[PDB]
Amino acid sequence: MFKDGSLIPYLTAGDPNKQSTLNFLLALDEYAGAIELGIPFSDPIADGKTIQESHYRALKNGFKLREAFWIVKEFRRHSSTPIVLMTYYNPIYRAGVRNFLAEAKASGVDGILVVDLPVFHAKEFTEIAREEGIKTVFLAAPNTPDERLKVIDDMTTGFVYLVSLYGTEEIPKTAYDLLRRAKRICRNKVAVGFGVSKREHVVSLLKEGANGVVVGSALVKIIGEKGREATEFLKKKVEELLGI
C-alpha cells in the first residue's frame, strides 16, 4: 500500500480534537508514505502505555466512532496518501462490519487494521472488506509463530503490521527476530510498529527489511505534551527520524 522506505505516521483520532488530528496529518504528509489513524476505545489492552493514554484522552475530549471518517473525508480534500484505519473489533461489531467498512470506503479509507479480530470471524470479515474495497491489515507480535505468520500473509491484502509490546532505548532483539522471520515468509510488504524514537532505529529497520516504519508513540508523546500546538514539534521529530 506504501512505497518502500516509507515512514508511516500514526495518530489517534481526536487527540486533542478531530480538527487538530486533521491539522497534524496535513502537516506530516510531505514526509509520510502512508498514514495510520487510530480509533480510541475503552479497553486498549493491546497497545502500549503512551498510545493507551491517547485513547483515554480522545474519549475524554468527547469522541464518537464516526468522527474518524470526518478526519479522513477532510484529509482527502488535500491528499491521496493511503489511509489505514486502526481499531478494536468492538466498535465495528456494534455498528455492523459491512456497514462500517462501506462507510470508511466512502470517506476515503483504503485499508483497515482490526487489532483483536476473533479468528472465529476473521474469514467473513476479510471477505466482506474485499467486497467493500477495503484492503486488510493484520498484526503480528514477537510471540507469533512462523505458521500463523503464513496464515496471516495469505489473508492480508494491504500489508502485514509487525509490533512489539516490548517498547525499547533500543529496538529489542525479539522485534528484530520477528522482522527477519516476517520478511522470510510474507509475500506482502510489512510495516513495523516497534515504537521508534531515534534516527538510528529508522535507519536500522529499513536496512533490515522493514518495507515501512510506523511512527506513533514518538508523535503521540509530543501530541500529549503540546496539544493543539503539537504541529511544529511533530515535524521536527519526523525530520529527526529522517535525518533532515
Domain chopping of the chain, boundaries: 1-244
What technique determined this structure?
A: X-ray
From residue 214, how far is each of 26, 33, 52, 59, 161 by CA, in Å?
17, 10, 17, 23, 9
Give me the sign of the Cα torsion angle 35, 206, 203, 193: positive
The catalytic site residues sit at: 36, 47
Cβ atoms of residues 122 and 156 within 8 Å = no
Beta bridge partners of 84: 36, 111
Beta bridge partners of 37: 11, 85
Give me the sign of the Cα torsion angle 68, 168, 43, 161: positive
**Residue position matching grid coordinates 527477519:** 180
Cβ atoms of residues 162 and 178 within 8 Å = yes
Q: Is the peptide bond before 145 cis (omega within 30 degrees of 0)?
A: no
CB neighbours of 47 closer than 8 A, spacing ≥ 6? 55, 115
CA distance 70 to 65: 10
- CATH superfamily, domain 1-244, is Aldolase class I (3.20.20.70)
User: Reported resolution in A?
Assistant: 2.4
> Grid coordinates standing for 214?
510506523
Crossing angle of the two packed helices 67-76 and 97-107, in degrees rounded to 10 = 30
Crossing angle of the two packed helices 18-28 and 67-76, in degrees rounded to 10 = 30
Instruction: Find the radius of gyration of the CA atoms of the chain.
Output: 16
Instruction: Determine the 3-state secondary structure of 45 from DSSP.
Output: coil
CA distance 72 to 11: 12
